[PDB]
């Protein structure tokens, strides 16, 4: 238990880029959630329609599905790793997906260390 | 015809809302028919048209 909530989660946003965990967007998260391989989730509160957040919640409740809440998808552009970077490594197109699901587990010892502790406290 | 136009994609914004009718408990009334396919079953809906029911991925069709 060394890393934080928004510190150990960049490892969750690391191997999904490597071994195909990213169910990012609006249609890739839920439509592949029902195929008994999806594991994690992060809800983002940014909405002009609260039904969007209300979509995610019952989707988290039909197969006892895990959930984290980090604030907004304008903030999550600085989290996920899907940005157009410039000549010096500075992102100019800062767009990240709100609801980021990670299906597969590349087996680690610092993301499952920190964040499974927060998972058992929540549920 | 001097100017042949092409196919603009229909700009329908935020339509996954219509796919899932979330009830007031935690249920979802799944208003669209699920495709029974082997390739694309259990995750991919079909299309409720005015008389028929049509999957788009493996091109499966019902009335
Ligand atoms: Zn089909």
UniProtKB/Swiss-Prot annotation, chain A:
Entry keyword set: Acetylation, Cytoplasm, Nucleus, Ribonucleoprotein, Ribosomal protein
Role of this protein? Part of the small subunit (SSU) processome, first precursor of the small eukaryotic ribosomal subunit. During the assembly of the SSU processome in the nucleolus, many ribosome biogenesis factors, an RNA chaperone and ribosomal proteins associate with the nascent pre-rRNA and work in concert to generate RNA folding, modifications, rearrangements and cleavage as well as targeted degradation of pre-ribosomal RNA by the RNA exosome. Subunit of the 40S ribosomal complex.
Q: Which organism is it from?
A: Homo sapiens (Human)
The protein's name: Small ribosomal subunit protein eS12
* Main localisation: cytoplasm
Tell where it localizes: Cytoplasm; Nucleus, Nucleolus
Q: What is a single molecular function from GO for this protein? A: RNA binding
Under PROSITE patterns, the record lists: RIBOSOMAL_S12E (PS01189)
Swiss-Prot record, chain B:
Give disulfide pairs as residue numbers. Answer: none
| PTM per Swiss-Prot/TrEMBL | Monoubiquitinated at Lys-21 and Lys-27 by RNF25 in response to ribosome collisions (ribosome stalling): ubiquitination promotes subsequent activation of RNF14, leading to EEF1A1 ubiquitination and degradation and rescue of stalled ribosomes. Deubiquitination at Lys-27 by USP16 is required for maturation of the 40S ribosomal complex.
List the subcellular locations.
Cytoplasm; Nucleus, Nucleolus
Q: Where is this cross-link: Glycyl lysine isopeptide (Lys-Gly) (interchain with G-Cter in ubiquitin)?
A: 21, 27
Q: Where are the zinc fingers (C4-type)?
A: 35-58
Report the superkingdom from the record. Eukaryota
Residues annotated as carrying N6-acetyllysine in the record are 18, 27
Outcome reported for the amino acid change (mutating residue 21 to R): Abolished monoubiquitination by RNF25, leading to impaired ability to rescue stalled ribosomes
Assembly and binders: Part of the 40S ribosomal subunit. Part of the small subunit (SSU) processome, composed of more than 70 proteins and the RNA chaperone small nucleolar RNA (snoRNA) U3.
User: What's this protein's function?
Assistant: Component of the 40S subunit of the ribosome. Part of the small subunit (SSU) processome, first precursor of the small eukaryotic ribosomal subunit. During the assembly of the SSU processome in the nucleolus, many ribosome biogenesis factors, an RNA chaperone and ribosomal proteins associate with the nascent pre-rRNA and work in concert to generate RNA folding, modifications, rearrangements and cleavage as well as targeted degradation of pre-ribosomal RNA by the RNA exosome.
Q: What is this protein called?
A: Small ribosomal subunit protein eS31
Origin organism is Homo sapiens
Q: Shown portion of the whole protein?
A: 87 to 149 of 156
